[PDB]
Symmetry: D2
Subunit: 494 residues, 4 copies
């Protein structure tokens, strides 16, 4: 039961958020934000750059000083504040979902049910960890009492993408704040608006000034000012593998800030002949087509065992033709646009390369309409490993179906990539489920399912799909810096 | 390479061990110890009773005093000492395996390979935990610094059975000493000898006097003096359910000592029609017949799905006929005797009740030989839930085979017992493996195997099969007592 | 800022709570509940006995069946429900606090601020753990995949006292429910009313029927029916050491249910000559006098170093005379009554024994008024270790002040008791704070403070003050039963 | 019992170690290795470069393949192998200590007692973790079974310095192998020899070929080939800040390899007026002067409260005059040389800058001897924060003494650096010990001691002193890569 979206949405929060106040850009420049389904301008936003990032970093640093309200507050109160923030998101759920759909080209009921649901659940999970992040007491050698503190890391710069704008925002700030950090967040230039609304809710919830700062603007300006900043203790980034390398490099060049990255993928989904086919087809399909193919974890290499290949192809093609393209706020639309022209063209070019290189176009395979960035859902069969569409992250509604016969071969092929974010396996065989999931070089492996992401699980990549984990117990701990304290005593006892 | 067993074994360690010295019993009484295969007396051992336990408890208490060598030693030195002990057991393996086989009625190659191997591995595992048992620092409300210590509990009384005498001995002392406790061990009256040899090695390894004390003797005398003792901080018991109840009652009446129990079982082994049959037959067979059926975890209700039941029965019966009974030191013998007359008679009485209640006797069914307590390997089929042989722990070489046709039924029947020590499930279906293992009320559930016990895993019962877990990470934490220390400070910071 | 208490409170929930419904006692009997400050009857409550407990246990067992709503619900939803319950407590805070003050003889603003605040904080802490209770994956020997499940224990019987009725109620149900158990709760006969109100809020929050059942009634009837019940998996108890022994015994005799206990104390508070005296006097004072001396953790042996003894006595006596006795709902009253006549007389008798045995009565020392169970706040000096008032838990407003000179002596004297719940030390010396807190045989040790209890910390006794811990990470885990699952695989890899 | 050092040492292991075999460099070049006390050449070693690193990386990759001996071995056997290696180091202790002292300029009794002792203890600690590294099972939302594996990361390049060559070698390989990784080690060009001896012992202990590979050689050649390598999964580096930046940059540019760094320091040691002076003088003195000042953690800003500053200076100066410089193998020598010319000259240049900037030269201040790189022990007083000797890591026997009078000031001054490796605080005040240790931005804070480093504790820097922790529980988790496995099931139960 999903309400009707708001239609005549008026914008309010369009400025830089520092110390719980709204500021104009130091330059005075602004940049436009668009609806990808219509190409209309939604509003303009202050364009943050280096000098705005520097103010935000100062604010975050002051809020993190020993003795400050955020440092001396009970851990349990950090938790309380995070739950209050989630209450405010629930109150503003329609507004946020509409806003997210409009700005992001995202199907409204998905934005309402999945994105917003995920935002709330994430924050609630995080809230619960605040007073449960613990250090140790250690029975070291000699007459000493030794303990550790799990302290916050400090000022954390957080740079995020356009595909799940609000959700990614909360994935970053929730764990950081739960652990006691302060943050400077740089939303994607395509999708600042829901993040800016969150600023108003952070203030309303009662967070002290300087605890969250938000600086909308471009990557090589505001983004790079964060990655290179001499007083940012940690940078966390989600985005393209290419900018990820630049972030790590900049961290090295500047102050050796801690780095965490999630960079997208080319995730294999392997379907063995004993799999439940109905289950497998639907999961594989959603796994590559969700949000117009704009998921990091997209099942973009679908390996199907020979004896079921033709049938799986047939069913996949049938499934891919059940969409109605158009405005994602409009009742009955089941596929939205891609986010912007750069992505649209990237994807068309890759689609052309699959045609040129001999893959079999089964459906779709070109643009749709004459307004907004729409691409027809496309399936290719007889794809081979050396094709661009088998190698490169497409980030559009383009499914690749490939054949295998040997178990050892499909594992080596699945693993033969610099990516490692996720993978899926479909089989009813216990032994294969365990051993194949052990052998895949992927951060998450799903078994008889795909795209199952929950706040209780750590999430992130092997190899060039990432450094570190987000969420679960394991993620939390990476927003802490360990301090060992060792005290000389006259006599130690067990 | 299993070497030849020693033959002409001379006994040396036959006394009460306290403060690293050997003592006569206070009464001067001794009790005889027998070889169950031949009924000949091996030697006499000092008969420990209440007054000897009191001496052992004072020794253990003194060794536990704040400022003693054992309390002030580095945790890592506790670990070194445990590893040194394991070296000594390695050195003395042939002698201990021989002794264990003679005293216990145990197949000599099994004593040498399984029991002794397990002793060594258990101690090595324990040794590694010693300086890794850690407390916490805790972000509690208010201007306080709080931490916890994982202290040893103190003086632990440890009462053990006759079926794996040396391995049980090490299962008790290893974790206890790892965590810094002192102990008073009470070996079974049937099988004190390898434990007494262990005293010599504990001394040789260099443990401080009073850290391990061993009081051979009977149950209602020495055992009960431990369970009722007003200065024992914890009792750990492995044995019968009946006596476990007495121990727990004694603890309640005396000084509320902490209690952990492992009490045996009536463990179900469920073989689904989709299972690998060769694998299931062998594991289920070893699962009930191992060590003349004298395993707490014996797979003594074998539920087999109707479509494969007859075949499974036929194959189990054929497998059960491949034994040579005799002296467990003699090459080619593959089944030894039961431990003693009382067990022998309990088993024959239960075999008799199966015949009387209408079970189908497939093979075996009575004694063998003219010396020592031997029973033919016995298989009953068409067993039903209401039969004594389906409800009571038999603890001899007696297999019950029953059938089932519904998943829900067989879970409910498996669970319908006051026991809950272990269970097995044989299937190739992923869903059944996870969901049935979740639904079984048993401490250890094996899938496509049985009797896989390892030091890294916690082991113990649901329901009346026990309280607490032994070994693994979890075991070690039940040999500690948690102390919270909360220190007022002028101002807390995260 | 505390509101005025309700004055004309009408009672509504007076029945047995089973399956989210209100039931008459099977017998039809009822028992009266009184205001201890006035001796007026508040109302009558259904008198639960064995047959009511049996219905409650059946309900709890059915709610815990595999497939039931409570077993299949997301862990995160158990958390959500617990936070909703805390929201309802906040909504009903005035009502509950008034009710608690009236029924319990508790100072209203303490009930409002401390008890109710604690109730809410406790539940919020618990809620946060629900989806963070995790098992393990274990790299055991051999070709196996091994994991553990932290499953709930089952049906947990929970028996509680009259001193902090609502708070103790939530201490029990919060962690149990967070971990997925079902419960049968037996409030104290003196103080059922706030617990019964909680039943209405549990239903209103949405908990499934049978998840919490509440059976008001007496100890040797309803209490003993729980401790002896053959289908209760665990009993948790707070109360007198005497009934604790009976609970453990009954657990042993019946079904070996798991036992956890918190049993009160004789806690030492040690004040060294370098202590801040202002701080120390006020903490020691509150530490023994809070809630009319009716805290388990009462600082009822106050050891003061010789050179400051006379001054500490003087200041303590002055502090003890600053009370206004009377009705705990009345503005300006700072000391309420004791809970009932049995306690009142226990305390008077102990006060008489201190007079008889030669302690120096410094103030108070007898009853007050002629209605309700009021005792004048009493301080004794020159108390010695062999006096009844130095040995026995008094549970009334009676402070014992004792002298020491030697550090080693005061430690041995502090430790010379069967009790071990808590202790305090006041010193500015780092070395003493660490080493003395290590040497004290007490579950919680406070340093330069006293009575600091928070949900993030495990809480419970050494020796005869308890078995197990409540709250913190450590408590949570004791409402779980560990299951190890070991799966045979073709080949294991690290 | 420190034995006499060997004199007439013959070298045997001088080559590149790959797959348990010794190789010439691919170029055929060798490089000379010197004794810094005498400047004489010890031997020549094969000069490893990019092509030799490529060979080592292929070997390590192959040894890491799914199904290899190293991947399929029981975790507990990894532990056994580590303990066996520690046995071999024990056997070869005199030879290794002699070698370490000759090659490193290190006091022979310190090499034998401290360095070698530490090597052995570090490996024993690591050995015990191997089969105790565990993942999780996770109660995630929905009908799923989720678990995590703590897998090894893979191929780890490990680049180490000249100051504790063998101990650093074991600090790197111990945890890495414990967790199941394979490695490529690059010892410092000044000090390859004990590491090459270790290759022989790795082979003798029985590790599979390719599990450890060692490539002696220079930094910008072999080191850089590791940090840039497209098939190394993680680089771990201990050394200068400057080079740490290069490594992190190289990782970003190449394959986003995981990076951990320990980079040295400018560690403050704060002595309050209430401290025990005798204790503080000695710890602060050893804290800066140990191993000719060549410790990352050197207490190189000594802040002393004004009321005791002059006395502290006087006593420090007297202590600094009790050295005999010479060959560190000669009985009675208590200070050896600096490692090499470049370090020697860096130190003299810094000493010079102290004189020029107005520090008060109390003793020492220039070179000594006519052979080897010796510098007089030097103490400067009246040092101020802006001086080169207060800002830069000197890494020679040079003590800076400064004064302070306010707690707030001294914390701010201690923290005002880009380093954050360690700090010490000397005080007897409980409040200061906890609160100042909390406020210091340093990885290890010692209280009333200094330089207490133990295998059970995590060790590493805040800020530009490092990324990540080594050793303790926490260290071991950075040699793992977390994989989440999520399996669809028909119905989940708690
Ligand atoms: N630890 C504590 O917080 C605590 C609380 C109350 C009392 N006490 C101590 O105990 C003394 C006596 O108080 P009490 O008589 O009110 O406490 P108690 O131990 O009798 O009662 C505690 C709870 O146990 C129940 N109970 C009583 N008898 C039982 C039995 N035979 N089987 C099962 N349950 C039973 C009661 O009905 C109540 O719910 C007090 O003076 C005090 O010293 C300690
Ligand atoms: C009874 C004991 C004391 N207490 C306090 O809050 C005293 C504080 C007084 C100074 C303002 C307290 C609190 C909680 O939460 C408890 C829980 C369980 C057992 C005992 C207590 C106490
Ligand atoms: Mg880009
Ligand atoms: Mg018996
Ligand atoms: Mg009573
Ligand atoms: Mg250099």
């Amino acid at each position: 039961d999903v309400p009707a979206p708001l239609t005549n949405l008026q914008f309010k929060y369009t400025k830089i958020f520092i110390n719980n106040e709204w500021h104009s850009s130091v330059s005075g420049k602004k940049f436009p934000v668009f609806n990808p389904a219509t190409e209309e301008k939604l509003c303009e936003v202050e364009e943050g750059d280096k000098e705005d990032v520097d103010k935000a970093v100062k604010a975050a640093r002051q809020a993190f000083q020993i003795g400050s309200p955020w440092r001396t507050m009970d851990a349990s109160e950090r938790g309380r504040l995070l739950n209050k923030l989630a209450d405010l998101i629930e109150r503003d759920r329609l507004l946020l979902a509409t806003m997210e759909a409009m700005n992001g080209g995202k199907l409204f009921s998905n934005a309402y049910l999945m994105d917003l649901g995920g935002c709330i659940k994430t924050l609630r999970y995080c809230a619960g960890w605040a007073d449960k992040i613990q250090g140790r007491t250690i029975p070291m050698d000699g007459n000493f009492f030794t303990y550790t503190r799990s302290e916050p890391v400090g000022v954390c710069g957080q740079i995020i993408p356009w595909n799940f704008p609000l959700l990614m925002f909360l994935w970053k700030i929730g764990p950081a704040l739960s652990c006691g950090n302060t943050v400077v967040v740089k939303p994607a230039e395509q999708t600042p608006l829901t993040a800016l609304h969150m600023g108003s809710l952070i203030k309303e919830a009662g967070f002290p000034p300087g605890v969250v700062n938000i600086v909308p603007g471009y990557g090589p300006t505001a983004g790079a000012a964060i990655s290179s900043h001499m007083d940012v203790d940690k940078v966390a980034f989600t985005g393209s593998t290419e900018v990820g390398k630049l972030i790590k490099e900049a961290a090295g060049k500047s102050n050796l800030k801690r780095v965490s990255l999630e960079l997208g993928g080319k995730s294999p989904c392997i379907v063995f002949a004993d799999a439940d086919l109905d289950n497998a087809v639907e999961f594989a399909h959603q796994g590559v087509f969700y949000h117009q193919g704009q998921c990091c974890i997209a099942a973009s290499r679908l390996f199907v065992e020979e004896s079921i290949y033709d049938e799986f192809v047939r069913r996949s093609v049938e499934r891919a033709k059940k969409y109605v393209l158009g405005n994602p706020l409009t009742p009955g639309v089941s596929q939205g646009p891609q986010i912007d022209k750069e992505q649209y063209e990237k994807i068309l070019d890759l689609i052309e390369s699959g045609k040129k290189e001999g893959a079999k176009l089964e459906c779709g395979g070109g643009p749709w309409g004459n307004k907004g960035y729409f691409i027809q859902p496309t399936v290719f069969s007889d794809v081979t490993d050396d094709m661009r569409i088998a190698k490169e992250e497409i980030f559009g509604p383009v499914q690749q179906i490939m054949k295998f016969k040997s178990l050892d071969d499909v594992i080596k092929r699945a693993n033969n990539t610099f990516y490692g974010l996720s993978a899926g396996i479909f089989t009813n065989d216990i032994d294969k489920a365990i051993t194949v999931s052990s052998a895949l070089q992927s951060g998450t492996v799903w078994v008889n399912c795909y795209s199952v992401v929950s706040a209780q699980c750590p999430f992130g990549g092997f190899k060039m799909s990432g450094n570190g984990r987000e969420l679960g117990e394991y993620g939390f701990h990476e927003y802490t810096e360990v301090k060992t304290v060792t005290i000389k005593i006259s006599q130690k006892n067990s």
